[PDB]
């Protein structure tokens, strides 16, 4: 028996406790579960109140600002999988500001597929460091467990457990005082286990009743059909919402139910690549008596009108709201603050967009290194600019290093300008190539010369040392002279040296330092321009106060004056390694 | 003691480049301080060129990274403006990635005879210091079309500071309890914490940037204090102290930046608390636990803004207006 109870739509349960009656029959939720804003409740309310039938949520769980609930070991004793087909702002489990909550007690939560966990502002919640999230999530690097009782070294954490040595210490792993984390061995990774360890069917996920049975598992990892974990479902059926397969009468039936204009939040369902979908992808329409997506005559791109001609993309949810769309009839703003890196799902979701008839704004994003996740964007029409008449706007990005791979990607702005401020990791070379490639004419683009590329190495050409003289203390160096195509735009050189007992010294990256593992930097005036190709004009420097029988890592960078002319990017040598002579 | 300069200019880039300047009262020439690093740099620059009174040429702080304040020019009161840089500039400063204080204008008097000013791309330098220099320096009288970058002077420097006020000071012979008033900026989630600084100080002239004036080292012991629940008065108990010793204390707030480049903040004044008695020493040195990294500060600030954005997204999603 996998899923005897029904498959419910998404539940929003607020202001009372009565609506939770509607979870008496939900084994799987094809939606999200928001349990939130329950003020006048007490632990005497949450005592006879249990949902053991609930097994899997396809989208996410959101518990927000609920008084009186003390543990989820009675509400969700058998929540085993969250799939995360639709996240809540990157996150699949959100336990936010549950006041009276003592312990999680999600002691069957064994695998969260997509998206991570966020648990914060639970003032009196402990039993956190004994959960072993690494065996729960495929990616653990962006959990969020901050602001708790366990934020203090106060809360307890006593429980009898596998005692993982996964970290450097001996932590017994447990959910409650009386429930240990069920740790499978190394072999049965996510397929399933028994208490004997006799592993069950490989097509299953989480717990399972009988070993090696496609029906007596708990949750299927690939697909669900007729009470059985199927890997792919054969096509007299069709896939549906990434977790279950279904007959054609269902998908046309929902097409009939939304075919009548009863609301404006449904979609007239069609079929593409054996998958029942809300609407056809780009370049397809439906055959009305067949409801399958057939290719159009030439292009029929999927156009997606934005609400008020503007949409901020700020997480995986807001990005996923533009999955499939290939024409953006308004303007986008990507504003992805904090986090580790989530350009992978930015690429899986905003990858196919080819047109934007507005502007593309990029503000305050911190974990983005490249706009390559716009994989197919080629056109910005500029038909609705930002004020100041901009079609591409870029502001305050602390880790952006690359706009696109300009050897492999085309982009064109029909009308409008370019905006590039406060972009320290993005070189001016990438921006200059963008202005060359986009078709931008002169157009008077504000591209701030001193706030762009400040904290990244942005030299394409290179230098080499010629002459090296070691000693017990001093080192003389001479490197081959650089001169820009205008020698007025050469300020000087920046000779870097530090002391290095090994040779695993990484290259300089633009950020400055002075403390202890710090490149000692010497500023050098350029030599006198002798107007002879072979003359005295080799520049060099003498290092005075260095210590004997030690190895110094050395290089040299130039120092130039930028301009609206797109030249003088300067030259950068390579790291050499010098052993000074010893002494007494 | 007049110290003439060969070839007019004199680039200083270390302690040693200044040691040709000790005891000089009037420098005839111009200076281009370009300091990118060093070791114990503050007291050394004070010892080498703190006695500079008048500079005949101009002055320049091109790209100097290590220094925090120009307070080591203690007797510097006059720049004659004889030799000028291009643009007719008597003071020039750019790309100064840690220049936070120009001078303490309550105690210091500067006269600039001719030549304009120049402040482009000073991140942690406030415009209030710049306008104070415009007024005290002698450029408002003799109106000169000064060129100051309005948008890149003060980046990640809070310049709109209110005043914190102390409420409770309980001394002992080895501990001091302090509680100041609670602060909240117009969105209270912006306040990340307070930064209790303290320093044993046998005199009541200790300003903020006295001491440190350098990246890599500091004169103040620093304690970082989370905010309380929003009412509670916050404070701290200083613990490892000496009996019968006067201290200098203040508390500074650190907030996040709104989505407009708008800052807030508050900063308590210097108050001196002496403990109780029982039965090269200007400072301590202060690396029993060396203080917090600026990139670690930006990581913490981004953690704060990330918690604030997720809470804003949740309140946006949950509450639905009446149609």
């Amino acid at each position: 028996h996998l899923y005897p109870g029904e498959v419910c739509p998404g539940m929003d349960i607020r202001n009372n406790l009565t609506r939770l009656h509607e979870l008496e029959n939900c084994s799987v939720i094809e939606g999200h579960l928001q349990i939130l804003l329950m003020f006048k409740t007490r632990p005497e309310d949450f005592r006879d109140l249990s949902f053991p039938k609930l097994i899997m949520i396809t989208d996410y769980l959101l518990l927000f600002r609920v008084y009186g609930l003390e543990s989820l070991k009675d509400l969700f004793p058998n929540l085993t999988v969250i799939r995360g087909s639709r996240l809540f702002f990157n996150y699949a489990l959100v336990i936010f500001e549950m006041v009276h909550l003592k312990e999680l007690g999600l002691y069957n939560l064994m695998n969260i597929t997509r998206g991570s966990v966020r648990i914060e502002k639970n003032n009196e919640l402990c039993y956190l460091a004994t959960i072993d999230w690494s065996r729960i999530l495929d990616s653990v690097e962006d959990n969020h467990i901050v602001l708790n009782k366990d934020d203090n070294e106060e809360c307890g954490d006593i429980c009898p457990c596998p005692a993982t040595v996964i970290n450097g210490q001996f932590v017994e792993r447990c959910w409650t005082h009386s429930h240990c984390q069920k740790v499978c061995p190394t072999i049965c990774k996510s397929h399933g286990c028994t208490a004997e360890g006799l592993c069950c069917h490989s097509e299953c996920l989480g717990n399972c009743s009988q070993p090696d049975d496609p029906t007596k598992c708990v949750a299927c990892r690939n697909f669900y059909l007729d009470g059985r974990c199927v890997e792919t479902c054969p096509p007299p059926y069709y896939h549906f919402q990434d977790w279950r397969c279904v007959n054609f009468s269902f998908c046309q039936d929902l097409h009939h139910k939304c075919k009548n204009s009863r609301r404006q939040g449904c979609h007239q369902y069609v079929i593409h690549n054996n998958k029942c979908i809300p609407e056809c992808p780009s370049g397809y329409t439906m055959n009305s008596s067949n409801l399958l997506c057939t290719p159009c005559l030439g292009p029929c791109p999927k156009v997606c009108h934005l609400l008020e001609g503007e949409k901020t993309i700020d997480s995986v949810t807001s990005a996923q709201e533009l999955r499939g769309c290939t024409v953006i009839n308004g303007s986008l703003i990507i504003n992805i603050r904090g986090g580790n890196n989530l350009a992978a799902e930015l690429e899986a979701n905003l990858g196919l967009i080819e047109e934007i008839s507005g502007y593309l704004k990029i503000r305050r994003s911190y974990a983005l290194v490249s706009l390559s996740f716009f994989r197919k964007l080629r056109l910005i029409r500029g038909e609705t600019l930002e004020i100041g008449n901009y079609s591409f706007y870029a502001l305050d990005n602390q880790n952006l290093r690359q706009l696109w791979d300009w050897s492999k990607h085309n982009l064109t702005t029909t009308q409008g300008k370019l905006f590039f401020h406060y972009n320290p990791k993005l070189c001016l070379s990438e921006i200059h190539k963008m202005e060359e490639v986009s078709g931008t004419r002169q157009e008077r683009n504000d591209i701030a010369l001193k706030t762009n590329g400040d904290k990244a190495s942005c030299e394409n050409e290179l230098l080499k040392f010629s002459y090296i003289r070691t000693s017990f203390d001093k080192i003389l160096l001479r490197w081959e002279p650089y001169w820009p195509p205008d020698f007025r735009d050469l300020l000087g050189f920046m000779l870097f040296y530090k002391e290095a007992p090994y040779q695993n010294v990484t290259e300089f990256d633009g950020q400055d330092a002075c403390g202890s593992n710090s490149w000692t930097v010497v500023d050098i005036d350029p030599p006198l321009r002798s107007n002879d190709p072979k003359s005295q004009n080799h520049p060099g420097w003498l290092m005075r106060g260095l210590k004997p029988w030690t190895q110094y890592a050395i290089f040299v960078k130039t120092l130039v004056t930028f301009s609206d002319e797109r030249r003088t990017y300067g030259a950068k040598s390579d790291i050499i390694y010098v052993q000074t002579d010893a002494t007494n | 003691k007049v110290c003439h300069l060969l070839e007019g200019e004199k680039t200083i880039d270390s302690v040693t480049s200044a040691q040709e300047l000790r005891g000089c009262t009037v420098i005839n020439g111009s200076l281009i301080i370009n300091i990118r690093g060093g070791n114990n740099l503050a007291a050394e620059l004070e010892a080498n060129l703190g006695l500079i009174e008048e500079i005949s040429g101009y002055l320049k702080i091109r790209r100097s990274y290590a220094l925090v304040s120009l307070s080591f020019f203690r007797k510097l009161r006059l720049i004659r403006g004889e030799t000028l840089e291009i643009g007719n500039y008597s003071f020039y400063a750019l790309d100064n990635q840690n220049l936070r204080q120009l001078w303490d204008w309550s105690k210091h008097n500067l006269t600039t005879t001719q030549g304009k000013l120049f402040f482009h791309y000073n991140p942690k330098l406030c415009l209030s210091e710049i306008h104070k220099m415009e007024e005290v320096s002698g450029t408002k009288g003799r109106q000169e079309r000064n060129d100051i970058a309005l948008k890149t002077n003060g980046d990640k420097a809070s310049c709109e500071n209110e005043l914190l006020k102390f409420s409770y000071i309980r001394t002992s012979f080895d501990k001091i309890l302090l509680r100041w008033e609670p602060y909240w900026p117009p969105d209270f989630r912006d306040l990340l914490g307070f930064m209790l600084f303290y320093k044993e100080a046998p005199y009541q002239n200790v300003t903020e940037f006295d001491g440190q004036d350098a990246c890599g080292s500091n004169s103040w012991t620093v304690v970082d204090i989370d905010p309380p629940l929003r009412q509670n008065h916050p404070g701290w108990l200083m613990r490892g102290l000496k009996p019968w010793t006067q201290y200098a204390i203040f508390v500074k707030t650190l907030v996040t930046f709104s989505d407009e480049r708008r800052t807030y903040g508050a900063k308590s004044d210097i108050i001196y608390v002496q403990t109780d008695a029982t039965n090269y020493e200007d400072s301590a040195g202060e690396c029993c636990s060396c203080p917090k990294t600026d990139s670690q500060i930006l990581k913490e600030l981004e953690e704060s803004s990330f918690r604030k954005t997720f809470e804003d997204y949740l309140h946006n999603v949950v509450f639905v207006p009446r149609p």
Binding site: L37, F39 | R189, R230, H315
Partner: peptide, 25 residues
Amino acid sequence: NQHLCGSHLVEALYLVCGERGFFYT
């Protein structure tokens, strides 16, 4: 301030409709 931000918007908007409820479709 009267900027009901943060969790103060929740606990301070609950005092406006403590028995009516928050609105949803």
